[model samples]
Target: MRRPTPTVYVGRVPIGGAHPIAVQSMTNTPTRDVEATTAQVLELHRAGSEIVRLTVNDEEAAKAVPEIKRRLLAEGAEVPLVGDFHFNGHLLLRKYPKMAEALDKFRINPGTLGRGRHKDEHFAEMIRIAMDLGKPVRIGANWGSLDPALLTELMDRNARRPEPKSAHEVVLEALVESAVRAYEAALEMGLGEDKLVLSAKVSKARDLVWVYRELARRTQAPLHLGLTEAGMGVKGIVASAAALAPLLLEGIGDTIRVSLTPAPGEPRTKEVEVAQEILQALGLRAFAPEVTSCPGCGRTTSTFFQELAEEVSRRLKERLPEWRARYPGVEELKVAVMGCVVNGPGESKHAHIGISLPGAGEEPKAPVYADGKLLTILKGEGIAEEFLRLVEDYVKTRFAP
Candidate 1:
């Protein structure tokens, strides 16, 4: 069963409380550049990010926020936009009400908000803006950006103990504490509990899991889970999976972002791919067609089957936008592409549609199955094209709106 959580709305998307685990990602564009930022937002939204965040740090960026929102809507990318604010958030949100209105949610960092009396005052000021504007607020605490005073006090208390925990461990506790306190403060200031979401993001896999497990126990608020600054390429994807997958299985994260340091000139939509895949892999949500194919073995015929698998997946993905619009339940469509006969026919038959290609010394024919019945047999160079036609036909015939 899923963990219990109070529901919060970022626009019409309802998060937590048994709602589908939402996918979120951030655009790396300079928010001040209206067209580029809007383009990236539209790209991420199109790639299945339910919520897309952009930095709203300066006057120019703040001014551009509403315009970006306008362009995205005009283009039909209506995903919720989140403003990620740092040291000057309280001021920015208050100074530019239009930006605040454009954003479906405001992400506040407790570490960046001022220290001592200024912290509570600034925090309250932010909560009031969200309250007045009727926007949901996400209070996220990152270990690197935590409040200095809070860290020192926690460290001092830990140092006094004979059995003090590791300094690294102290920071983890402080992150959770920071997030929980912000949640409480927001509630105290009459920001409805339903308007709140919380997070304690860490970089390492183990540390992230531990931090959120503790946070989950401490508060009933919905958690926005992420592994911050998860490095480039395979490292980022794997580490994020290692941390997030387990937490999600245990019913911890409500909404998630896989923050990747993209490769140079990499598209910003890569993060959206990973986040959507994470939720889809967990069976928490579905965003794209699930294509199952085998890793070719010695019994398989060269790499032809592997290439066929790739081509099948590529065609399905290419047509997904149109398919999603025309065939309402297409994202959950399952198609199997298998090489060799070992488990090929059986697996394929199990799926809604499956193609079992010939193995070495076999008949050199590919057999197709649909709804557990043999649909056809194809041999020759155009088998790939013919198979795809069959798959497309199955989608339209079975899932048409």
Candidate 2:
């Protein structure tokens, strides 16, 4: 086999090339709120986030960084922390010297410093500070917030006539150039290849994919992927996946974040779950244990099995901490929720755990199996609850002590 693509280390994890495409999420909590930010980061960390990012918009927010780090470390949370800087990055870093060393990575936006052709000196200093700290910096560029000068020029050109380049091309060019400039500056400052990551994010799916494809051709730096402002609820998840899934299967992204306008305490799911599903579907990563069950066909029995399958999945997530603590390395567990026996047995072979239901006119029993071996049968209303207990027991026995 050919040698795998090389990847760089992000704190304790690797990203890019043949490295496992890491699942990442950003804290939506206000960075100034240490308590809230700390709690949210902890929650995301528990939910299987390999990397987490938080924005530091001001001096106060930057001050909160060390305390948040202390809190997470006290609780055994080792997730990498990324500081996102926009217009006032240089000033923020100047004010909080400790903050520079505290962060694992810094995400910079160079275009944020430009206005109608004048460059902001503060932005350049911010790069100097990051270099001084010897931390990796991600040159993050976005389309919606394209530099004002570039935006005006593009609109002016578009207004002149049916343009040589469409608005999308202008926007893509601006993002790619901004990202490249930032990377070049980082390199000029004596930072090595391993000290950088780059991204070009757009709200719409097609635009986001195109920007990345073009950027990949222009540079070899590891890329961070995302579909920004993808909306809220299911719409956001579907839109992000619709765009990223296709690109990831072809081996394009190194890291990703899912932007969702979700309410606080809504379980902290974001664009990343969509990433997980894409990986799981393509067999790139078995993010969650999967189960295969047949639809209620002519050979099918009860719909109870289908309902139970969903319940099993729900319960697994709800009790993830308990199972994780019990099964030391249980990353994800999938239990099938099939309708009946039409194809349950054959499917069970692919899953670590499964429930094969008896077909119509045969029996009403639901047989549960562990790693392809018949373990037990369920015959009551509390079968789902009892199955959870069985899984918990299995986890306790199998995990590291």
Candidate 3:
């Protein structure tokens, strides 16, 4: 049930249509700190972020855009950079020609521009700059910061209805109406259909999904999906995944970002990692080889099995770029590390390569399987090392092109 949508290109990256769903992350650093911001942008790029966005809220930030793009290009990183602007984007983009040209995409929050006629003027100017520069624009409408004028108008209209809708319902309607109207405005401002992307972001999972469903029914614009302000830690991860999984399965989203609040001093790349995990779990995209390990239960007593699984995952992550270069299709490789014999053997046999560790009362030897056949058994002190070698060898041999 994939929704039919037109394609839009942000620099060299193609979104919508049949292209792979793009993964993006926004930098937490101040845009004016070119040194820190460029370093983090490159870090996210190396970690598999296809698109990176930065805030361009002020004159200083606008001036730094060119230098950041210059530094990234000099470092051989060509990820498409997006400018996230609100309030005075029309002014800043108009004031700084270099900033307008440096970004591959421009993100406009139509709700924040202004009220009534002023809002219309601001939006038109921004769209005009993007069209003149031949760059794509994302008309991102956020619920928390939605246009007060539109929301109030919708609310007043709902109040006059024979059966008045709830406030939340009005907000949902506003989200869709705002995005659609913004796209239409961009079109009327001389921006081509292929140059526009749309997003209607909300904080709640139910609201996020509902608005997107409504948006899909209303327009064919490529949708950038996210549950905005998804909080910190596991709560954030679980919430983002739950929200995105449904829309993605129905083939509704064109690009995605998991906006996780990092723990104190945590790297911003953590958000990129979570986004990759969700896409891989849904079988939409594969960034690296996947490892399946069982949670230890009463049937198993050995702690070494858990350690080995962690070690294997760590090694695979470190060596992924190398593996991807040397072996084609390595990203699709599945490796299983099971805890005990309860369901270990069956799971092992299912994976491309797997290992079944002994149960509490079972023999000490660990059996390895490759392509559904028993490959070998290891009883010595080097079982973990040997099994890792086997997994590595399997990738090199099976996926070699």
Candidate 4:
């Protein structure tokens, strides 16, 4: 079961209180460019981001906030918009009332909100804007931007101990302390727990899991999970999954963000897809049909097995939009493509629809299973085409309403 907490609505996407762990992503486009930023927001939304965040650093970006909302609305995207505020949040939220009003939620890095006495002042004032505007506040406490005073106090406390904690351990505790402190402060500032979400992000996988585990043990707020500064491409995805999966499996996170540094011109939508894929892999949610293919061994012809598996994936990508229109719950569909006779038919039989292909030097006939029963057998070179055709029929028959 999911960890339960107060439901903080980021627009229509609810966080915590047993909600489906939401998938969210952030925009990289210059927020001042209303056209580009809105377009990117729409792109992430279309790719299945439940909530989209944009950096609001300066006056022009703050000024463009309402326009971005208007563009998103007129363009038919209703995904929640979160303004990620760093150092200038207190100023931006107070000076530009429209920015606060336009955003569905305000994501504040409590550490960077200010330093020293002004830290508490700015943090309070910014959250006050959220409370006054009836918007949710996601207190994102990052390792890269920890509250200086709090970290110092914790460091001092640790040093005073007979056996001091490791610097890394003390930093971890500091992050949790900062997040929960911000949480309680937000509540005291009149923002209800129902309108607050919390996150303490670190780049290292193990460190992230440790911090969130402690946060879950201590804090009552809805948690947003992510590995900050997760590097580009596969590195980012694997690091994020490694950290988040452990916490999520323990029922700790309320939402997830996969922070992938996109290569030049790479679609920002990949992070959204990555986040969705993680949830799907965990069996927590399904955004697309899963194609469970084996890691081929010597028993199967490697190239042939990969070709068939790739065809399954390619066909699904081309067909899912239409399949989605025709089938209400098609995203939950499970299809398996197995290579060789060893464990092939067994794995095949386990899926909603599955095909076990011929192994090296074996008979060319491929057995297909539907609903755990032998559906048909196919022979010869057109296996990919024929099997996909069979799958089309299976889906049409199984889901037609």
Candidate 5:
């Protein structure tokens, strides 16, 4: 059961309130670099990021916001752009009215805002600008940069407990409190419920889930879930998935981002793809055709099947944008490439289209099936190319949005 939440609109896109879980990613490029940031933003948008965020740490970056917006619009991209503010966002947003007006939403890290009455005033100023412009705001509270003052207060309070909780438990409680308090403060400043989105992110998988679960129990505000600082490479993917899966399964998260630190030479779009894959794997949304391939066994002596599967997958992804434009619902296409006959036929029968390559010492032909029926068998040369063509044709003819 999906958790019920109030819909908050960021421009024309709606999240929560029975809406599809939205996916988001942030730019790694220096925000002051207009060309690089614009290119990265467009790349993320084309890769299917529903919302994109850029840091607005200084005046130069602040000046680049409208230019980035102009470039994105001129290029026909209408993805929602969010300004990620740290300690000085409130000042920057007020100083740059064009940037404030250009962005679809504002992401304020309550944890990073200055402490005490000063923090309150800074947060109030940002919320006021957002309210003035009628833009939705995300009170994004993160564990890594949690307010030192609040954490200290909570820690001191816990020290007085007869049965003191662990420091981990105290921090978790503080995170939830921080998010809720920020929402309440925003509401007090006249921002409506529909104009607010909430988030409380942690790096540890279990702690992230725990904070979100607790936050969900307390607020109907849509939650934007992410495992912050989810490391690089496979560690990032595994940690992000472990943190998000349990909470999302319980209907806790309304939108998500897999905050992977890209390895050397990795594309920026990898994070967007990971977020899409997580939602697709959980059956919450489908962004592209899924290719199900197998690891070859002893029965599969050659690497032909593996190589062909890789090619088919590459082709599908490469053509997705074209397919999306020319054919509706091509994203729902299910493709399979199997190594041997044992599970091949059954698996192919399961997918919209599937191919079973010959095993060791067996006939050197590949049997292709469409919707459980054997369509044809290809032998000798050009088999891989022929199979892919059929798969493409099947999608054009059969799938409907």
Candidate 6:
């Protein structure tokens, strides 16, 4: 674990320097849908969202800010909320002073409004407003809708190769380059490093991870991570997790969100679940129990291992908070449900506790091991359920005061 450092406070949470990566998710609930947006923010807060963002693009949406704040306070949801604005962000910020007062942070995209003079004027004004209000701001650059002039320049620069790079490369370069520009612009507007969060969001997993890695290497400001336009369902979760896992393993991210397209009339709380699942998997943040199970091989026959793993995973999710409060500092809590005997013992030895059934034609009951000693042996007769209860009871006993 990295040592803690002094960090700027966001609501009651902290970020940057040496703080643990703050986990957050944004509600796709239209800002004007104050009731629904407040509900989702509270839901995300309960689901472990330290910072929550809501979109604020127009007059009605901007005005919804304070109402949303009141709703959260009334409901006892203290999660910090950010207002996302684009294009005419400066105008909205000027038009809605209450927005400055309501949100914990402001998210602005310089390219949203347009290019050249119009974009520069609007973005400069937005930064100035944010600076004047002493509100932190996020400068998000996306690949799909890039600044037209920058895209044209990048296209022209990459035009001459015999085997040309795709427009994808152009978009990636644009996001990073634009981010650097936005970061400098924040400083130029008198916004300090502690007041800015940089984001380079791309839809593709490979591109998203690569761009973020490069960006992290280049800058020290806290980054707000996302796989933008990440599609819905199991596919999005798997893809986002695969891409984010390695980067997170290397200590490359500061915060993240899974941008699943919101279902028609349904808000974006599902995306928060997806991001939480990934962070939970990498041990970056623990929302649920950590399950360790082996991949089955030819020697494995019962097919019970996968089923047991899934069951345990679900149980972990259901009983997460209770368990965390109980085992606050117990890192040696290891449980293994393995596929076969060949690889199981070594794995079990390393585990604080483990169980591996012998494969086909082998003995039904086997010895359980804890550090090479035969802790106990169990045979058929409903042992799995018994073991589950035993483990739970053990955790309670060890942790209960």
Model 6 per-residue lDDT tens digits across residues 1-401 = 33222355677777774776777888766889988888878888887788998888889998889999988888677889888887667888898888787888888875696666888878878878877877888888888767778777778877977777888777787778888877887787788877888888888888988898877876667787778877867777777777777777767777788777666765556777778778766666655445577888888876677776677666656666677766764433656677778877777666556667777767887556654555677777676776576557656765565
Q: After superposition, how far is residue 319 of candidate 3 from its true place, in Å?
A: 2.3
- The digit string of per-residue lDDT tens for model 4 on 145-172 reads 8887888999999999999999989989
Which residue pairs overlap in candidate 2's backbone? 258-271, 309-337
lDDT of 3 by residue, 1-401 (tens): 66777889988889986788999999989999999999999999888799999999899999999999999889788899999998999999999999999999999997889877999899989998998999999999988888888898899999999999899999999988999999988888889878999999999998888999998888888899999999999999999999999999988999999989999999899999999999999999998988899997877757888898998898888888899899999999889898888878899999999998987898988889999989988786988889989998998899999
Off by over 4 Å in 3: none
Give model 6's TM-score versus the native structure. 0.87
Could you give the C-alpha RMSD of every candidate to the true structure, in order shown? 1.7, 3.9, 1.2, 1.2, 1.7, 3.3
Error of 3 at 355 (Å): 0.4
Q: What TM-score does model 4 achieve against the real structure?
A: 0.98
- Taken over the whole model, the C-alpha lDDT of each candidate is 0.90, 0.75, 0.91, 0.90, 0.91, 0.75
Q: What lDDT tens digits, residue by residue, belong to model 2 across residues 1-401?
A: 11133466777888877688788888888988989999988778766678889999888999999888888889888888989887778778888988887888888876666554345466567777867877777888887666767567666766777546777677777787778766777777677788788888889888887888887877778888889888888888888888887777767888878888775556675555666776677666765555455666766655666676777777777776665555655765556555566667656645666767677776778777777777788775787787777776666665546
Could you give me the TM-score of model 1 versus the true structure? 0.95
Per-candidate TM equals 0.95, 0.83, 0.98, 0.98, 0.95, 0.87
Off by over 4 Å in 2: 1-7, 116-120, 151-163, 269-275, 294-303, 318-334, 359-401
Ranked by lDDT, the better of candidates 3 and 4 is 3
Better of 3 and 6 by TM-score: 3
Instruction: Tell me the spans in candidate 5 whose CA falls farther than 4 Å from its real position.
Output: none
Q: Candidate 2 clash total?
A: 2
Report the lDDT tens digits of candidate 1 across residue range 116-168.
88988888888999999999999999988988888898999999999999999
| Number of the candidate with higher lDDT, 1 or 3 | 3
Better of 1 and 6 by TM-score: 1
**Which residue pairs overlap in candidate 6's backbone?**
87-113
Candidate 5 per-residue lDDT, tens place, 55-170, comes to 99899999999999999899788899999999999899989999999999999988888978899999999999999999999999988888888889899999999999999999
User: Candidate 6 — which residues are off by over 4 angstroms?
Assistant: 1-8, 154-168, 262-269, 297-307, 330-333, 370-373, 397-401
